[PDB]
Amino acid sequence: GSHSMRYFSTSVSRPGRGEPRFIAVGYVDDTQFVRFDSDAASQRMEPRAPWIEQEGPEYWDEETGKVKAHSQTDRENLRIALRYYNQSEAGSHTLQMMFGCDVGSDGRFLRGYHQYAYDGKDYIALKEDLRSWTAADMAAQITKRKWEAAHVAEQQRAYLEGTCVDGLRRYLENGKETLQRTDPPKTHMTHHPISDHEATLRCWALGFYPAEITLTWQRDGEDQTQDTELVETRPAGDGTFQKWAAVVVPSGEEQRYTCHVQHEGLPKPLTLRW
């Protein structure tokens, strides 16, 4: 299947408690491989996956430079946005950026991304054509006119089709024994009496990679779209993921319910029954 590379950066002001903090992380699919933290001691881009440690000292110098520069840029961008919105310096504000690319099984470019959020909501984003911008409000329209005048989209298009793609393919090769694997979910069901009249059936999916998965309950073959409790997919901490889905059932009716698991590491979707 396809693969993605993403970098996520967060800049947070903390008025009266220091200068803004900048954190950046890089992912291939659901595997983190680098980070930078403006508060940390090293002041360096740091490895977080075995397969990136082989990159030489010039990789780390160049990457450290680009991310420290982004850090300074977004620090100034918080000041600019404050001014655009005429917001008070007392407030704590947030600037998030996401960029990266998708490639197919043959490694061809599938999609690029370059987008910003301010205080948790859309600010400006590069459209799929990699030629135009979507601006969320009047402040971002100022930025949009600025970036149109400086041809910023041409530079981001070039990065996304060129360097971003080349890096992803390279990372996919160097970490092939780790990144191109799938781990199928290990599955089971637990049963927890509520009262004398009701019990919870919980359907479990453990140790899977990648994180994408679907768990659904059926009663006599019919979906239980809204009496189902679902938790957010969570990391185990070892590079695999976990999720469960629960349904409240009247005691004696446990056998009418089926749980259904879809994951790309499965050749066929699973059906589980108490």
Binding site: E63, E76, T143, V152
Partner: peptide, 9 residues
């Protein structure tokens, strides 16, 4: 590979 160019709002 990180972006080579950041620009101002």
């Amino acid at each position: 590979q990180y972006i080579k160019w950041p620009w101002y709002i």
